[PDB]
Design a protein around this ligand. Structure first.
Ligand SMILES: OC[C@@H]1[C@@H](O[C@@H]2O[C@H](CO)[C@@H](O)[C@H](O)[C@@H]2O)[C@H](O)[C@H](O)c2nccn21
Ligand code: NA
Ligand code: NA
Length: 367
């Protein structure tokens, strides 16, 4: 019964959304960022994943990241070559996996990265002096998306559906599009333009739009109000997402493990209730425990609290962040295990659970 904001979405895109809406009651798709590009201990192989090395299966959802595309770079901000990324997206889609894309856009005013807080949103939105820049930036994605297309024997063009998740964690103050650096109304104008430009002016038909505040900056006593800070309206959002590293053991969170588990369940319950009221689909669009230091992280801190409540359980997917390559990134950073890592057997159990789906047990999502 949920309907996409693109009334003309491709058959495959419509089918994905419909099939997520059906499977969410009894299942949870697992996702991983940059999962085919590299792992903690390897880079270069054209068909490998840390996740598959542990479980024998690829993630169901593949996350990818565009930062740097807008600057005409050959590779993204983490040195993922864009041509290889296009081939990895096509490969995952060909196996029936789901594609999601985020975009840590560089600061156009200073040339710094997304964490450079020099104000820019007011200049980028319609009427702003740098509005031409925003168009040029979005045009680089249009071009990237064309490199994902195939043409069938009858001459018809086909694309992978993409869950496009821009301008994330906007209730935080860490990105230049965040609270304190952009007004709420300017953020909304930025989001609305992004949709109007891609969906209406450029006529992309293979996008599903995901909204993703950060949990850590929402007051649990007033969840809906906090979640809806900067919300652009139901005509602009398909997935009611959430980035929640906080309730899964973030080092700065002084709450007890039991309080954290209760808060994870409550956050996802309320997320799902918002989605239900709006006729959308909810998802835990980012989470994880950096360096997987928590014993039985997967079953005790993620799956248990999700499965505890039948509302919380109605999220469609959960994605964890990237497994940065040690040989080149000097800071150890990873969110899925690799063989021999302490949580590997517990991640096998997470995989094995009837609820959780990896690529190998997905139904046909695109028909
Ligand atoms: O802090 C973890 C994660 C963030 O991770 C960063 O992601 C960028 C882009 O891939 C990368 O260059 C950095 O090295 C680092 O991995 C990311 O911003 C993500 O959206 C998020 N949200 C909360 C925590 N993270
Ligand atoms: Na679910
Ligand atoms: Na399973």
């Amino acid at each position: 019964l949920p309907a996409l904001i693109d009334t003309q979405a491709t058959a495959e895109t419509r089918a994905l959304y419909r099939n997520l809406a059906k499977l969410r009651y009894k299942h949870l798709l697992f996702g991983h960022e940059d999962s085919l590009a590299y792992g903690v201990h390897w880079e270069g192989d054209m068909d490998r994943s840390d996740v598959r090395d542990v479980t024998g299966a690829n993630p169901a959802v593949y996350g990818w990241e565009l930062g740097g595309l807008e600057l005409g770079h050959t590779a993204n901000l983490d040195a993922v070559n864009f041509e290889k990324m296009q081939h990895w997206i096509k490969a995952g889609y060909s196996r029936g996996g789901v594609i999601t894309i985020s975009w840590h856009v560089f600061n156009p005013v200073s040339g710094g990265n997304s964490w450079d807080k020099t104000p820019a949103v007011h200049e980028l939105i319609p009427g702003g002096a740098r509005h031409a820049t925003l168009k040029a930036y979005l045009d680089t994605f249009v071009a990237f998306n064309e490199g994902l297309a195939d043409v069938d024997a009858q001459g018809n063009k086909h694309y992978p559906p993409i869950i496009f998740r821009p301008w994330h964690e906007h209730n935080g103050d860490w990105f230049w599009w965040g609270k304190g650096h952009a007004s709420e109304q300017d953020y909304i104008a930025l989001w609305r333009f992004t949709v109007h430009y891609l969906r209406d002016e450029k006529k992309l038909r293979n996008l599903i739009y995901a909204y993703s505040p950060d949990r850590s900056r929402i007051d649990m006593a007033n969840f809906e109000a906090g979640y809806l800070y900067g919300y652009p309206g139901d005509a602009y959002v398909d997935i009611i997402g959430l980035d929640n590293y906080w309730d899964v053991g973030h080092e700065a969170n002084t709450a007890s493990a039991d309080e954290q588990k209760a808060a994870l369940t409550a956050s996802l319950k309320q997320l799902v209730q918002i989605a239900r009221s709006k006729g959308k689909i909810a998802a835990l669009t980012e989470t994880g425990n950096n360096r997987l230091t928590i014993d039985n992280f997967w079953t005790e801190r993620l799956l248990g609290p999700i499965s505890a409540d039948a509302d919380a359980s109605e999220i469609a997917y959960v994605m964890v962040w990237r497994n940065a390559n040690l040989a080149r990134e000097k800071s150890e950073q990873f969110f899925a295990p690799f063989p021999g890592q302490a949580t590997a057997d517990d991640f096998k159990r997470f995989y094995q659970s009837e609820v959780v789906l990896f690529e190998d047990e997905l139904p046909p999502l695109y028909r």
